[PDB]
Amino acid sequence: ELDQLRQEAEQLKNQIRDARKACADATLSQITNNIDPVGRIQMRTRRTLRGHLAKIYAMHWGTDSRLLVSASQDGKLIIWDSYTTNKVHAIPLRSSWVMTCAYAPSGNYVACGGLDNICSIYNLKTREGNVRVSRELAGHTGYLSCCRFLDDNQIVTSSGDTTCALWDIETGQQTTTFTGHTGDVMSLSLAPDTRLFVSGACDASAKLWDVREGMCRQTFTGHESDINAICFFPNGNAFATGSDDATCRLFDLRADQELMTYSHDNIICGITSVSFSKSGRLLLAGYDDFNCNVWDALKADRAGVLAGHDNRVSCLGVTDDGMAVATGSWDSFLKIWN
Amino acid sequence: SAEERAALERSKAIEKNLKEDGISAAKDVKLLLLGADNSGKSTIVKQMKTTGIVETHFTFKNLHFRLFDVGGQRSERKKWIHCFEDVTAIIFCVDLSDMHESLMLFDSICNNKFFIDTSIILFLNKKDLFGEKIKKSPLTICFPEYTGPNTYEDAAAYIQAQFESKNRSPNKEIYCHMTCATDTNNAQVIFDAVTDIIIANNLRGCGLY
Amino acid sequence: TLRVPDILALVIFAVVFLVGVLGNALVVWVTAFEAKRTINAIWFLNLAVADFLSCLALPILFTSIVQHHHWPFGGAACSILPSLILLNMYASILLLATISADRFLLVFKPIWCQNFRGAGLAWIACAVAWGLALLLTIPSFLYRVVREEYFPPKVLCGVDYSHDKRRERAVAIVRLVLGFLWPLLTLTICYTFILLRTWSRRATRSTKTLKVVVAVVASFFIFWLPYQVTGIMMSFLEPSSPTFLLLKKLDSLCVSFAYINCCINPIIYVVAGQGFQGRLRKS
Amino acid sequence: FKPXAX
Amino acid sequence: DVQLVESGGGLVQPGGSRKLSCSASGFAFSSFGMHWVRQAPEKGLEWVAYISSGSGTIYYADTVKGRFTISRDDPKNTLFLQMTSLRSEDTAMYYCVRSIYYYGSSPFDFWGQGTTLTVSSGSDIVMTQATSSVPVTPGESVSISCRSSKSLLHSNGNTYLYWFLQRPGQSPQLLIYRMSNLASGVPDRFSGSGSGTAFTLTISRLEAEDVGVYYCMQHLEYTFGAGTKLEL
Amino acid sequence: ASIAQARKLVEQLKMEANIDRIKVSKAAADLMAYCEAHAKEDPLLTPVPASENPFR
Question: H/E/C letters for each residue in chain C?
Answer: CCCHHHHHHHHHHHHHHHHHHHHHHHHHHHHHHCCCCCHHHHHHHHHHHHHHHHHHCHHHHHHHHHCCCCCCCHHHHHHHHHHHHHHHHHHHHHHHHHHHHHHHHHHCCCCHHHHCCCHHHHHHHHHHHHHHHHHHHHHHHHCEEEEEECCCCEEEEEECCCCCHHHHHHHHHHHHHHHHHHHHHHHHHHHHHHHHHHCCCCCCCCCHHHHHHHHHHHHHHHHHHHHHHHHHHHHHCCCCCHHHHHHHHHHHHHHHHHHHHHHHHHHHHHHCCCCHHHHHHHC
Name chain B contacts of A53, Cβ cutoff 8 Å.
22
Residues near A10 by Cβ (< 8 Å), separated by ≥ 6? none
Q: Where are the domains of chain F?
A: 3-55
CATH number of the domain where residue C187 is located? 1.20.1070.10
Amino acid making up residue B56: T
- Determine how β-strand E198-203 pairs with β-strand E190-195: antiparallel
Distance (Å, whole) CA B19 – CA B12: 11
Of A53, A87, A183, the CB nearest to B11: A87
Return the closest-CA partner of residue C144 out of C240, C57, C80, C85.
C80
Looking at the complex, report in whole angstroms how far the Cα of residue B21 sits from the nearest Cα belonging to chain E: 18
SS3 at position B69: strand
Give the CATH fold of the E127-231 domain: Immunoglobulin-like (2.60.40)
Distance (Å, whole) CA F15 – CA A213: 14
E10: left (phi over 0), alpha (psi -120 to 50) or beta: left
Which CATH code is given to the segment(s) E3-119? 2.60.40.10
Nearest-10 crossing angle of helices B100-110, B152-164 = 40
Based on its alpha-carbon atoms, the radius of gyration of chain C, rounded to whole angstroms, reads 21
Distance (Å, whole) CA C168 – CA D2: 12
Distance (Å, whole) CA C155 – CA C47: 35
- What φ, ψ does residue F13 adopt, rounded to 5°? -65, -40
User: Which helix (H) or strand (E) covers residue F29, if one does?
Assistant: helix F24-38
Q: List, in order of start, the domains of chain B with CATH numbers.
A: 28-204 (3.40.50.300)
The residue range of the domain holding C161 is: 4-282
SS3 at position B146: coil
C208 in reach of chain B (CB within 8 A): yes
* B21 touches B33 (CB < 8 A): no
Looking at the complex, report in whole angstroms how far the Cα of residue B180 sits from the nearest Cα belonging to chain A: 33
Distance (Å, whole) CA A272 – CA A56: 13
Which residue numbers come right before each break in chain B (C to N over 2.5 Å)?
Answer: 49, 98
Distance (Å, whole) CA A177 – CA A164: 6
Residues near B137 by Cβ (< 8 Å), separated by ≥ 6? none
B173 in reach of chain C (CB within 8 A): yes
Neighbours of B11 (CB within 10 A): 21
Name chain B contacts of C99, Cβ cutoff 8 Å.
none
* C84 touches C57 (CB < 8 A): yes
Looking at the complex, report in whole angstroms how far the Cα of residue E140 sits from the nearest Cα belonging to chain A: 34
Residues near E230 by Cβ (< 8 Å), separated by ≥ 6? E134, E136, E142, E210, E211, E212, E214
Determine, for residues A129 and E103 on separate chains, whether the beta-carbon distance falls below 8 Å. no
Distance (Å, whole) CA C73 – CA C93: 29
Q: In what order do the strands lie in the sheet with A257-262?
A: A227-232, A238-243, A248-252, A257-262
Name chain C contacts of B206, Cβ cutoff 8 Å.
40, 103, 106
Distance (Å, whole) CA A262 – CA E131: 70
CATH number belonging to the domain at F3-55, selected among 1.10.3720.10, 1.10.10.10, 3.40.50.720, 4.10.260.10: 4.10.260.10
Reduced to 3 DSSP states, what percent helix, strand and coil does chain B have, rounded to the nearest 5? Answer: 45, 15, 40
Looking at the complex, report in whole angstroms how far the Cα of residue C140 sits from the nearest Cα belonging to chain D: 8
Name chain D contacts of C156, Cβ cutoff 8 Å.
1, 3
Of A233, A259, A323, the CB nearest to F43: A323
Of A81, A88, A129, the CB nearest to E31: A129
Beta bridge partners of A59: A70
Of D1, D2, D5, the CB nearest to C82: D5
Query: How far is it between the farthest Cα atoms of chain F?
Result: 69
End-to-end CA distance of chain A: 62
Name chain C contacts of D1, Cβ cutoff 8 Å.
147, 156, 158, 160, 239
Neighbours of chain E (3+ CB pairs under 8 A): A, B
Name chain C contacts of D5, Cβ cutoff 8 Å.
82, 86, 251, 255
E6: left (phi over 0), alpha (psi -120 to 50) or beta: beta
What residue in F sits closest to A280 (Cα-Cα)? Answer: F35
What residue in C sits closest to B173 (Cα-Cα)? Answer: C203
Distance (Å, whole) CA A227 – CA A220: 11
Query: How far is it between the farthest Cα atoms of chain C?
Result: 73
The three state secondary structure string of chain A is: CHHHHHHHHHHHHHHHHHHHHHCCCCCHHHCHHHCCCCCCCCCCEEEEECCCCCCCCEECCCCCCCECCEECCCCEEEEEECCCCCEEEEEECCCCCEEEEEECCCCCEEEEEECCCCEEEEECCCCCCCCEEEEEECCCCCCEEEEEECCCCEEEEEECCCEEEEEECCCCEEEEEEECCCCCEEEEEECCCCCEEEEEECCCCEEEEECCCCCEEEEECCCCCCEEEEEECCCCCEEEEEECCCCEEEEECCCCEEEEEECCCCCCCCEEEEEECCCCCEEEEEECCCCEEEEECCCCCEEEECCCCCCCCCEEEECCCCCCEEEECCCCCEEEEC
Q: How many residues does chain D have?
A: 6
Q: Where are the domains of chain E?
A: 3-119, 127-231
Distance (Å, whole) CA B63 – CA B197: 14
Residues near B85 by Cβ (< 8 Å), separated by ≥ 6? B114, B115
Looking at the complex, report in whole angstroms how far the Cα of residue B7 sits from the nearest Cα belonging to chain E: 5
* B104 touches B158 (CB < 8 A): no
Return the closest-CA partner of residue B89 out of B59, B56, B66.
B66
- Determine how β-strand B174-178 pairs with β-strand B119-125: parallel
Determine, for residues F14 and A324 on separate chains, whether the beta-carbon distance falls below 8 Å. no
* A204 touches A165 (CB < 8 A): no
Q: How many residues does chain F have?
A: 56
Alpha helical stretches, state H, chain B:
4-24, 41-48, 100-110, 127-136, 152-164, 186-205
Return the closest-CA partner of residue A156 out of A177, A126, A130, A138.
A177
Name chain B contacts of C274, Cβ cutoff 8 Å.
207
SS3 at position B177: strand
Q: How many residues does chain C have?
A: 283
Based on its alpha-carbon atoms, the radius of gyration of chain F, rounded to whole angstroms, reads 24
Domains E3-119 and E127-231 share a fold: yes
The DSSP string of E108-168 is: S--B---EEEEE-------EEES-SEEE--TT--EEEEEEESS--B-TTS-B-EEEEEE-T
Name chain B contacts of C201, Cβ cutoff 8 Å.
196
Looking at the complex, report in whole angstroms how far the Cα of residue E180 sits from the nearest Cα belonging to chain B: 18
Determine, for residues A27 and F24 on separate chains, whether the beta-carbon distance falls below 8 Å. yes
Amino acid making up residue C79: S
Distance (Å, whole) CA E223 – CA E123: 12
Name chain B contacts of E35, Cβ cutoff 8 Å.
none
Determine, for residues B2 and E160 on separate chains, whether the beta-carbon distance falls below 8 Å. yes
Return the closest-CA partner of residue A91 out of A75, A80, A77.
A77
Distance (Å, whole) CA C33 – CA A267: 32
Alpha carbon A55 to its chain's center: 18
Distance (Å, whole) CA A5 – CA A17: 18
Classify residue E54 by burial, with Cβ atoms within 10 Å: 0-12, 13-18, 19+: middle
Determine, for residues F44 and A25 on separate chains, whether the beta-carbon distance falls below 8 Å. no
Give Cα separations from C281 to A257, B207, C41, C276 (angstroms).
45, 19, 17, 9
> CA dihedral defined by B157, B160, B161, B164, rounded to 10 degrees?
-160
Domain count, chain C: 1
Residues near B140 by Cβ (< 8 Å), separated by ≥ 6? B146
What residue in E sits closest to A81 (Cα-Cα)? Answer: E103
Distance (Å, whole) CA A99 – CA E109: 37
* E119 touches E85 (CB < 8 A): no
**Chains E+B touching (3+ CB pairs under 8 Å):** yes
Q: List, in order of start, the domains of chain A with CATH numbers.
A: 1-338 (2.130.10.10)
Distance (Å, whole) CA B165 – CA F21: 59
Distance (Å, whole) CA A231 – CA A301: 19
Beta bridge partners of E11: E118
A33 in reach of chain F (CB within 8 A): no
- Determine how β-strand A132-137 pairs with β-strand A144-149: unpaired
E178 in reach of chain B (CB within 8 A): no
B57 in reach of chain A (CB within 8 A): no
* E108 touches E206 (CB < 8 A): no
Q: Which residues of A153-173 are buried (b: 16+ CB within 10 A; e: fewer)?
A: eebbbbbbbbbbbbbebeeee
Neighbours of B65 (CB within 10 A): 19
A130 in reach of chain E (CB within 8 A): yes
